[PDB]
Ligand binder design. Structure first.
Ligand code: GLU
Length: 277
């Protein structure tokens, strides 16, 4: 299926499972296995989700060869700093049961330690322990600041992105510095869900005989954004993957784009750094 190319030529599958909010053990292992069974080849996790064991279990259970799957995980705020970050990588690696990790990200920028943390990601990349390195919830100013002090520039930035918060500024900033955007959103585990409940998505979903969530995912795909919808439900997990047998029209894309309100719904990167030390 579709892949997005990072600035080091590694190809990152465009659709993945978010396991954010999945309880460890069975819940995750099932979610991951079900995803892989359905065809997903990309799992997105994070130390702080406390479910790296379960992810590893799901992957081993699926029976799919390691190199055919992409695994992303992330260094938590409290493990920022060169040596601390290096150590959190190993704790994550051991917990996933993996010899290498495909992508490792800084989970939140913070203020004082992210340049230092990035130096550790560069090391892991030189040591061939990760295939790609990037950041999450970084804003252009963070990225501009990081650019002053790095040898390898970030390859991914995973941020809140959905039809009411379309991140146009950052998208252009990332187009211009060769960075792939990954979209997360406060959906899948059943939050307020205003994002999905509007006439534009409704009628596009109805026209194609799909759900509004399937539409948003497809909209992500056709904008070349990487998308990691989270769910622990076997059916929803399957539904989120059934997005390859239809195309949104150029007009349908402008219509969804028109929904932009720059309405952030999750936490603000400039003022959010729980666990910071
Ligand atoms: N994947 C979520 C994790 C939430 C958290 O930071 O605990 C995010 O970065 O938005």
């Amino acid at each position: 299926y579709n892949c997005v190319t990072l600035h080091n030529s590694v190809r990152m599958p465009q659709l993945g499972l978010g396991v954010w909010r999945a309880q460890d053990g069975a819940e995750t292992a099932n979610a991951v296995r079900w995803a892989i069974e359905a065809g997903y080849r990309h799992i997105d996790t994070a130390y702080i989700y406390s479910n790296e064991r379960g992810v590893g279990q799901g992957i081993r259970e699926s029976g799919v060869p390691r190199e055919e799957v992409w695994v992303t995980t992330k260094v938590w705020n409290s493990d920022q700093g060169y040596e601390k970050t290096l150590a959190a990588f190993e704790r994550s690696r051991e917990l996933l049961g993996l010899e290498y990790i495909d992508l490792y990200l800084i989970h939140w920028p913070g203020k004082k330690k992210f340049v230092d943390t990035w130096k550790a990601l560069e090391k892991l990349y030189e040591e061939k322990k990760v295939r790609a390195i990037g950041v999450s919830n970084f804003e252009p100013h963070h990225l501009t600041e990081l650019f002053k002090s790095c040898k390898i520039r970030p390859m991914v930035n995973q941020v809140e992105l959905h039809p009411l918060f379309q991140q146009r500024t950052l998208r252009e900033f990332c187009k211009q510095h060769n960075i792939a955007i990954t979209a997360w959103s406060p959906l899948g585990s059943g939050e307020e869900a205003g994002i999905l409940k509007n006439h534009v998505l409704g009628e596009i979903a109805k026209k194609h005989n799909k759900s509004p969530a399937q539409v948003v995912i497809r909209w992500d795909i056709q904008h070349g954004i990487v998308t990691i919808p989270k769910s622990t439900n076997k059916g929803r997990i399957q539904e989120n993957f059934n997005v390859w047998d239809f195309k949104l029209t150029e007009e349908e894309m402008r219509q969804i784009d028109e929904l932009n309100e720059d309405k952030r719904i999750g936490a603000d990167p400039d003022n959010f750094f729980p666990g910071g030390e």
